[PDB]
Amino acid sequence: MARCDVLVSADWAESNLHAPKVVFVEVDEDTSAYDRDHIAGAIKLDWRTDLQDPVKRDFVDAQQFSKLLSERGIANEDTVILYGGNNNWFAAYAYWYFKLYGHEKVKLLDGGRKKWELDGRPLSSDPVSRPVTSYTASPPDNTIRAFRDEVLAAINVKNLIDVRSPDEFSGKILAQEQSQRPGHIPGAINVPWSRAANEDGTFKSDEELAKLYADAGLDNSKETIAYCRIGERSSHTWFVLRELLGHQNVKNYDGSWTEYGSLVGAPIELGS
């Protein structure tokens, strides 16, 4: 259970905007928000153009990730503080990428942009450029990623946490984030991602979070995989399960329903 090491408050953040070897990184859909204004000194990662493979359906490999961080001026030894709008979803997605590629010191700004703005804390429109660095990633740690064949093999073996809306989960509605069939993975439990967050964007307490998943049916005798439509809301939930609640065996299934719901002959379950 690692809340102390993985999360920083807006209060800590504002007092540490120019602290040695700390870098703030805004991650979202596009950089429109960041280009309007941002936390002072923060740099941006574009979740679509910087972090996705432009040809294959995948995110960037270790070399592409290293090249990107080198160009943006992030070092292996920097403490990276990630934040964003769209509910800190893409910031949590980036946090998961950082851990995948072996980065040690990285944390989320609790509540992201929503909490910062709600607090009335200053934002800046000054441009930011950092001197380039030499970042070298590790090979992916696939203990935190699930692929399609292991997800199919996990049915009835691992907890499968579906963080989509209840209407998607039951298959009442199908959903660019489309698939061939509605429904969920058999045996999956539905905990819509937002149940783990407060109105102001912050994560709920360890007490609230443990109750939420225990009541929904998370089985502590089983390992776990989280999923949504694309790796997005599921990365936020992955962070909750692994980093805050301390489960050691949690994978993000980034293929998610856009993959699974398009697979020929995959088991599908309806209703709930």
CSV table of C-alpha atoms in Angstrom, one decimal:
chain,number,residue,atom,x,y,z
A,1,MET,CA,0.0,0.0,0.0
A,2,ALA,CA,2.0,2.9,-1.4
A,3,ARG,CA,0.1,6.2,-1.2
A,4,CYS,CA,3.0,8.0,0.5
A,5,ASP,CA,5.4,7.3,-2.5
A,6,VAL,CA,3.0,7.6,-5.5
A,7,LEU,CA,0.9,10.6,-4.8
A,8,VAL,CA,1.6,14.3,-4.0
A,9,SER,CA,-0.9,17.0,-2.9
A,10,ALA,CA,-1.5,20.2,-4.8
A,11,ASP,CA,-0.2,21.9,-1.7
A,12,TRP,CA,3.2,20.0,-1.9
A,13,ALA,CA,3.3,20.6,-5.6
A,14,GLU,CA,2.9,24.4,-5.5
A,15,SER,CA,5.7,24.6,-2.9
A,16,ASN,CA,8.0,22.5,-5.1
A,17,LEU,CA,7.5,23.8,-8.6
A,18,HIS,CA,11.2,24.7,-8.9
A,19,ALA,CA,12.7,22.0,-6.6
A,20,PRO,CA,15.9,20.2,-7.7
A,21,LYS,CA,15.4,17.2,-10.0
A,22,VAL,CA,11.6,17.5,-9.9
A,23,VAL,CA,9.7,18.0,-13.3
A,24,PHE,CA,6.0,18.5,-13.8
A,25,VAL,CA,4.4,16.9,-16.9
A,26,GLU,CA,0.9,17.6,-18.1
A,27,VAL,CA,-0.7,14.7,-20.0
A,28,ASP,CA,-3.9,14.8,-21.9
A,29,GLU,CA,-5.8,14.0,-25.2
A,30,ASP,CA,-4.2,17.0,-27.0
A,31,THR,CA,-2.3,19.9,-25.6
A,32,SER,CA,-5.0,22.4,-26.1
A,33,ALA,CA,-5.5,22.8,-22.3
A,34,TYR,CA,-1.7,23.0,-21.7
A,35,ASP,CA,-1.2,25.6,-24.5
A,36,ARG,CA,-3.9,27.9,-22.9
A,37,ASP,CA,-2.2,27.6,-19.5
A,38,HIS,CA,-0.3,25.1,-17.3
A,39,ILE,CA,1.4,24.6,-14.0
A,40,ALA,CA,4.5,26.9,-14.0
A,41,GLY,CA,7.4,25.2,-15.6
A,42,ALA,CA,5.5,22.1,-16.6
A,43,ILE,CA,6.1,20.4,-20.0
A,44,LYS,CA,3.5,18.5,-22.0
A,45,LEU,CA,3.1,15.0,-23.4
A,46,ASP,CA,0.5,14.6,-26.1
A,47,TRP,CA,-1.2,11.3,-25.4
A,48,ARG,CA,-2.2,10.8,-29.1
A,49,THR,CA,0.9,12.1,-31.0
A,50,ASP,CA,3.7,11.5,-28.5
A,51,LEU,CA,2.7,8.3,-26.8
A,52,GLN,CA,1.0,6.2,-29.4
A,53,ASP,CA,2.7,4.3,-32.3
A,54,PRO,CA,1.6,6.1,-35.4
A,55,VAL,CA,1.2,3.0,-37.5
A,56,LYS,CA,0.6,-0.1,-35.3
A,57,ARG,CA,-2.0,-0.3,-32.6
A,58,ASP,CA,0.4,0.0,-29.7
A,59,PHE,CA,2.1,2.7,-27.6
A,60,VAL,CA,5.7,3.7,-28.1
A,61,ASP,CA,8.4,1.1,-27.5
A,62,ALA,CA,11.3,1.6,-25.1
A,63,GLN,CA,13.6,3.4,-27.7
A,64,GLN,CA,10.8,5.7,-28.9
A,65,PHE,CA,9.9,6.5,-25.3
A,66,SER,CA,13.6,7.1,-24.4
A,67,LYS,CA,13.9,9.4,-27.5
A,68,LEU,CA,10.8,11.3,-26.5
A,69,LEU,CA,11.9,11.9,-22.9
A,70,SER,CA,15.4,12.9,-24.0
A,71,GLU,CA,13.9,15.5,-26.4
A,72,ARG,CA,11.5,16.9,-23.7
A,73,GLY,CA,14.3,17.1,-21.1
A,74,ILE,CA,13.3,14.4,-18.6
A,75,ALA,CA,16.1,12.4,-16.9
A,76,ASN,CA,16.1,8.9,-15.4
A,77,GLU,CA,16.9,10.5,-12.0
A,78,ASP,CA,14.2,13.2,-12.1
A,79,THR,CA,11.1,12.9,-9.9
A,80,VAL,CA,8.3,13.1,-12.5
A,81,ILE,CA,5.0,14.6,-11.3
A,82,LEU,CA,2.1,13.8,-13.7
A,83,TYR,CA,-1.2,15.7,-13.9
A,84,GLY,CA,-3.9,16.5,-16.3
A,85,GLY,CA,-7.6,17.2,-17.2
A,86,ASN,CA,-10.0,14.7,-18.5
A,87,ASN,CA,-10.1,13.4,-14.8
A,88,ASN,CA,-6.3,12.7,-14.6
A,89,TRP,CA,-7.1,9.6,-16.8
A,90,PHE,CA,-4.3,10.3,-19.3
A,91,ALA,CA,-2.0,11.3,-16.5
A,92,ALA,CA,-2.7,7.9,-14.9
A,93,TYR,CA,-2.1,6.3,-18.3
A,94,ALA,CA,1.2,8.0,-18.5
A,95,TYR,CA,2.1,7.0,-14.9
A,96,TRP,CA,1.5,3.4,-16.0
A,97,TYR,CA,3.8,3.9,-19.1
A,98,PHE,CA,6.5,5.3,-16.8
A,99,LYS,CA,6.3,2.2,-14.5
A,100,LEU,CA,6.2,-0.1,-17.6
A,101,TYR,CA,9.5,1.4,-18.7
A,102,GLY,CA,11.1,1.2,-15.3
A,103,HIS,CA,11.0,4.8,-14.0
A,104,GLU,CA,11.5,4.8,-10.2
A,105,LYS,CA,10.5,8.3,-9.0
A,106,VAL,CA,7.1,9.2,-10.4
A,107,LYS,CA,3.9,10.3,-8.8
A,108,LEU,CA,0.5,11.7,-9.6
A,109,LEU,CA,-0.7,15.1,-8.6
A,110,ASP,CA,-3.7,14.1,-6.5
A,111,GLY,CA,-6.8,15.5,-8.3
A,112,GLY,CA,-4.8,16.7,-11.3
A,113,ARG,CA,-5.8,19.9,-13.1
A,114,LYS,CA,-9.4,19.8,-11.8
A,115,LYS,CA,-8.2,20.0,-8.1
A,116,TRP,CA,-5.5,22.6,-9.0
A,117,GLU,CA,-8.1,24.8,-10.7
A,118,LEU,CA,-10.7,24.3,-8.0
A,119,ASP,CA,-8.1,25.4,-5.4
A,120,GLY,CA,-7.6,28.6,-7.4
A,121,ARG,CA,-3.9,28.0,-7.8
A,122,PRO,CA,-2.0,30.0,-10.4
A,123,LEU,CA,-1.5,28.7,-13.9
A,124,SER,CA,0.9,30.1,-16.5
A,125,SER,CA,0.8,30.6,-20.2
A,126,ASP,CA,4.6,31.2,-20.5
A,127,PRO,CA,6.2,28.8,-23.0
A,128,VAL,CA,8.5,26.2,-21.4
A,129,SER,CA,11.6,24.5,-23.0
A,130,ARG,CA,13.9,22.2,-21.0
A,131,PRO,CA,17.5,21.4,-22.0
A,132,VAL,CA,17.6,17.9,-23.6
A,133,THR,CA,18.6,14.9,-21.6
A,134,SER,CA,19.7,11.4,-22.2
A,135,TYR,CA,16.9,9.2,-21.0
A,136,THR,CA,17.3,5.4,-21.3
A,137,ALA,CA,14.2,3.3,-20.5
A,138,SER,CA,14.2,-0.3,-19.3
A,139,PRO,CA,12.5,-3.1,-21.4
A,140,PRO,CA,8.8,-3.3,-20.6
A,141,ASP,CA,7.8,-4.8,-17.3
A,142,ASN,CA,5.0,-6.9,-18.6
A,143,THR,CA,4.0,-8.0,-15.1
A,144,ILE,CA,1.8,-4.9,-15.3
A,145,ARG,CA,0.3,-5.4,-18.8
A,146,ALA,CA,-2.1,-8.0,-20.0
A,147,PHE,CA,-2.4,-9.1,-23.6
A,148,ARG,CA,-5.4,-10.8,-25.4
A,149,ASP,CA,-4.4,-14.4,-25.0
A,150,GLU,CA,-3.8,-14.1,-21.3
A,151,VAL,CA,-7.1,-12.2,-20.8
A,152,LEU,CA,-9.0,-15.1,-22.5
A,153,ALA,CA,-7.0,-17.5,-20.2
A,154,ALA,CA,-7.9,-15.5,-17.1
A,155,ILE,CA,-11.7,-16.0,-17.4
A,156,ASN,CA,-12.7,-17.5,-14.0
A,157,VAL,CA,-9.0,-17.5,-12.8
A,158,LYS,CA,-8.3,-13.8,-12.1
A,159,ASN,CA,-10.5,-10.8,-11.1
A,160,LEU,CA,-11.5,-8.9,-14.2
A,161,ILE,CA,-12.5,-5.4,-13.3
A,162,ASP,CA,-14.6,-3.6,-16.0
A,163,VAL,CA,-14.4,0.1,-15.4
A,164,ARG,CA,-16.8,1.2,-18.1
A,165,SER,CA,-20.4,2.5,-17.4
A,166,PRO,CA,-23.0,0.1,-16.2
A,167,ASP,CA,-24.9,0.4,-19.6
A,168,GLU,CA,-21.8,-0.6,-21.5
A,169,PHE,CA,-21.1,-3.4,-19.1
A,170,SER,CA,-24.6,-4.9,-19.4
A,171,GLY,CA,-24.4,-4.6,-23.2
A,172,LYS,CA,-27.4,-2.3,-23.4
A,173,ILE,CA,-25.2,0.0,-25.5
A,174,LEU,CA,-22.2,-0.9,-27.7
A,175,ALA,CA,-20.3,2.3,-26.8
A,176,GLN,CA,-14.0,5.7,-32.6
A,177,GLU,CA,-14.0,3.4,-29.5
A,178,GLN,CA,-16.2,0.8,-31.1
A,179,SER,CA,-16.3,-3.0,-31.3
A,180,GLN,CA,-18.2,-5.8,-33.0
A,181,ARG,CA,-20.3,-6.9,-30.0
A,182,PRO,CA,-21.7,-5.4,-26.8
A,183,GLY,CA,-21.3,-7.1,-23.3
A,184,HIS,CA,-18.4,-7.8,-20.9
A,185,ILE,CA,-15.8,-10.4,-20.3
A,186,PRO,CA,-17.5,-13.4,-18.5
A,187,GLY,CA,-17.2,-13.2,-14.7
A,188,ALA,CA,-16.0,-9.6,-14.9
A,189,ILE,CA,-17.2,-7.2,-12.2
A,190,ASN,CA,-18.2,-3.6,-13.0
A,191,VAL,CA,-16.7,-0.8,-11.0
A,192,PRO,CA,-17.1,2.3,-13.1
A,193,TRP,CA,-13.7,4.2,-12.8
A,194,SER,CA,-15.2,7.4,-11.3
A,195,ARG,CA,-16.4,5.6,-8.1
A,196,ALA,CA,-12.8,5.7,-6.9
A,197,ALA,CA,-12.5,9.5,-7.2
A,198,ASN,CA,-14.0,12.5,-5.3
A,199,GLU,CA,-15.9,15.4,-6.9
A,200,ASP,CA,-12.8,17.5,-6.8
A,201,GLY,CA,-10.8,14.8,-8.7
A,202,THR,CA,-8.8,13.5,-5.7
A,203,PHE,CA,-8.5,9.7,-5.0
A,204,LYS,CA,-10.8,8.4,-2.3
A,205,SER,CA,-9.4,7.2,1.0
A,206,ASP,CA,-7.9,3.7,1.4
A,207,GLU,CA,-10.9,2.8,3.6
A,208,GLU,CA,-13.4,4.0,1.0
A,209,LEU,CA,-11.5,2.3,-1.8
A,210,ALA,CA,-11.1,-1.1,-0.1
A,211,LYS,CA,-14.8,-1.2,0.7
A,212,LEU,CA,-15.7,-0.2,-2.9
A,213,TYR,CA,-13.8,-3.2,-4.5
A,214,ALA,CA,-14.6,-5.6,-1.7
A,215,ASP,CA,-18.4,-4.9,-2.0
A,216,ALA,CA,-18.2,-5.3,-5.8
A,217,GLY,CA,-16.6,-8.7,-5.4
A,218,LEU,CA,-12.8,-8.3,-5.8
A,219,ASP,CA,-11.5,-11.7,-4.7
A,220,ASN,CA,-8.3,-11.4,-2.6
A,221,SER,CA,-7.4,-15.0,-3.4
A,222,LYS,CA,-7.0,-14.0,-7.1
A,223,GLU,CA,-4.7,-11.8,-9.1
A,224,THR,CA,-6.3,-9.0,-11.2
A,225,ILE,CA,-6.7,-7.4,-14.6
A,226,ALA,CA,-8.5,-4.1,-15.2
A,227,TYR,CA,-10.0,-3.0,-18.6
A,228,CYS,CA,-12.2,-0.3,-20.2
A,229,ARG,CA,-12.6,0.5,-24.0
A,230,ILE,CA,-9.0,1.6,-24.6
A,231,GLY,CA,-6.3,1.4,-21.9
A,232,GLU,CA,-7.6,4.7,-20.4
A,233,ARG,CA,-10.0,4.6,-17.4
A,234,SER,CA,-8.5,1.3,-16.7
A,235,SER,CA,-5.1,2.8,-16.1
A,236,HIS,CA,-6.7,5.0,-13.4
A,237,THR,CA,-8.2,2.0,-11.8
A,238,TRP,CA,-4.9,0.0,-12.1
A,239,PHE,CA,-3.2,2.8,-10.1
A,240,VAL,CA,-5.9,2.6,-7.4
A,241,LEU,CA,-5.6,-1.2,-7.2
A,242,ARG,CA,-1.8,-1.6,-7.4
A,243,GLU,CA,-0.3,1.6,-6.1
A,244,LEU,CA,-2.8,2.8,-3.4
A,245,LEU,CA,-4.4,-0.5,-2.3
A,246,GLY,CA,-1.2,-2.5,-2.6
A,247,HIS,CA,-2.2,-5.5,-4.7
A,248,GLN,CA,1.0,-6.9,-6.1
A,249,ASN,CA,-0.5,-8.7,-9.1
A,250,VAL,CA,-2.5,-6.2,-11.2
A,251,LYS,CA,-2.3,-5.8,-14.9
A,252,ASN,CA,-3.8,-3.2,-17.2
A,253,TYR,CA,-5.4,-4.8,-20.3
A,254,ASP,CA,-4.7,-1.9,-22.8
A,255,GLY,CA,-6.4,-3.7,-25.7
A,256,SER,CA,-9.6,-3.5,-23.6
A,257,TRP,CA,-13.1,-3.8,-25.2
A,258,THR,CA,-12.1,-2.3,-28.5
A,259,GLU,CA,-9.9,-5.3,-29.0
A,260,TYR,CA,-11.8,-8.0,-27.0
A,261,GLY,CA,-15.2,-7.1,-28.4
A,262,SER,CA,-13.8,-7.4,-32.0
A,263,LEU,CA,-12.1,-10.8,-31.5
A,264,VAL,CA,-13.7,-13.7,-33.3
A,265,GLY,CA,-15.1,-16.4,-31.0
A,266,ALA,CA,-14.3,-14.7,-27.7
A,267,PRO,CA,-16.7,-15.5,-24.8
A,268,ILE,CA,-19.1,-12.7,-24.0
A,269,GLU,CA,-21.5,-12.2,-21.1
A,270,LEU,CA,-24.5,-9.9,-21.1
A,271,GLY,CA,-26.5,-8.0,-18.5
A,272,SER,CA,-26.1,-7.1,-14.9
